Each structure stands twice: as structure tokens, then as C-alpha cells.
A and B are shown apart, each in its own frame.
Chain A
Amino acid sequence: AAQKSFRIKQKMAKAKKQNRPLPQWIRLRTNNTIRYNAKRRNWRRTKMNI
């Protein structure tokens, strides 16, 4: 909704900052086993459920 509460907007801000792929320099580290972002979220795939 346009008229939203601050708690909702703060959670939305955290989700926006989490929405990213991996930095490329992570892949170059020694013994790196992280190859993709397995917790990535999109607005049309999984709903945040408030």
C-alpha cells in the first residue's frame, strides 16, 4: 500500500538491500564453496509474507 507503516517500510528496505547477486571477488577466495546466492528473492516468485 502507498500509506504504509514504518515497520513495513523498514523490512522492505532490508529486503531491497539484500536483493543482489554475489560479489565477483568472493569466487576468487581460497577454498570458496559459495557459487551462487541461494537465498535470492524476486517480487514475482516468492512473497515476503509481510
Chain B
Amino acid sequence: RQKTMIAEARNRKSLKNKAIMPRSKLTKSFGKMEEHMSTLGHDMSALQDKQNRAARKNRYVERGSDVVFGDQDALTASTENGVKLRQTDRLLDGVADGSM
């Protein structure tokens, strides 16, 4: 187990070329947390309670915007040169219709 941990640490670490990312800035997943705690042999009841509370707090409720524009797109003609509403188009301002 000690030799295996040495090999895993060697494959993980690359300290000569760059630094390791900070854990205080990174975030990880509850599935990995649960499986690591299960490997360590702890009790996951409290952690599962916290995760269930977080999942029940994180709910998605539809609104009028989701009902009306959920699958729609555009609603405005895209310009040929990618210009704004009041931006002059040197090439195309003198031709009103798209056929011409």
C-alpha cells in the first residue's frame, strides 16, 4: 500500500514545471467524498443528510420566460456584417431589400 501510494503521488504531482492548484479555490463532488469516506470506514449518514438538504434546497422552478422562450431563439434578424442596431453598414445601407 505504501509503494502504491508513492506511485499515485508521483503520477499526481508535477511540482518541477508548475504549482498545484489550491484546494481552497477548487471544488469537488459528493460522490467522490462519499466513496472516500466509505473507503476510510466512517459513517456517511450525516454527510448524506447534508447533501439531501442541499439537493432539496436546489430546486428548479419554471417561469414565464421558460414557458415562452424556453425553446425559441432569435426574435431579431441577424445582420450580414454583425452590426448593432444603430451601427452604419457602409456596404449594404444603399440596398434596402435582400433580393437585390
Q: Are A and B in direct contact (Cβ within 8 Å)?
A: yes
Residues of A within 8 A of B (CB): 20-21, 23-25, 28
| Interface size class, chain B | under 10
Q: How many A-B residue pairs have CB under 8 A?
A: 14
Given A21-B91, A23-B90, 12 further pairs, Cβ under 8 A: A20-B90, A23-B91, A23-B93, A23-B94, A24-B91, A24-B92, A24-B94, A24-B95, A25-B94, A25-B95, A28-B95, A28-B100
Docked complex: B52-100 residues within 8 A CB-CB of A: 90-95, 100
B90 cross-chain contacts in A, Cβ below 8 A: 20, 23
Interface of chain A, helix or strand or loop or mixed? Answer: loop
In the complex, which of the residues A20, A25, A28 has the most CB atoms of chain B within 10 Å of its own CB atom?
A25
A24 cross-chain contacts in B, Cβ below 8 A: 91-92, 94-95
| A14 CB, min distance to chain B CBs, angstroms | 17
Complex CA gap A25/B91 in Å reads 8
Complex CA gap A20/B89 in Å reads 12
- Chain B residue with Cβ nearest A24: B95
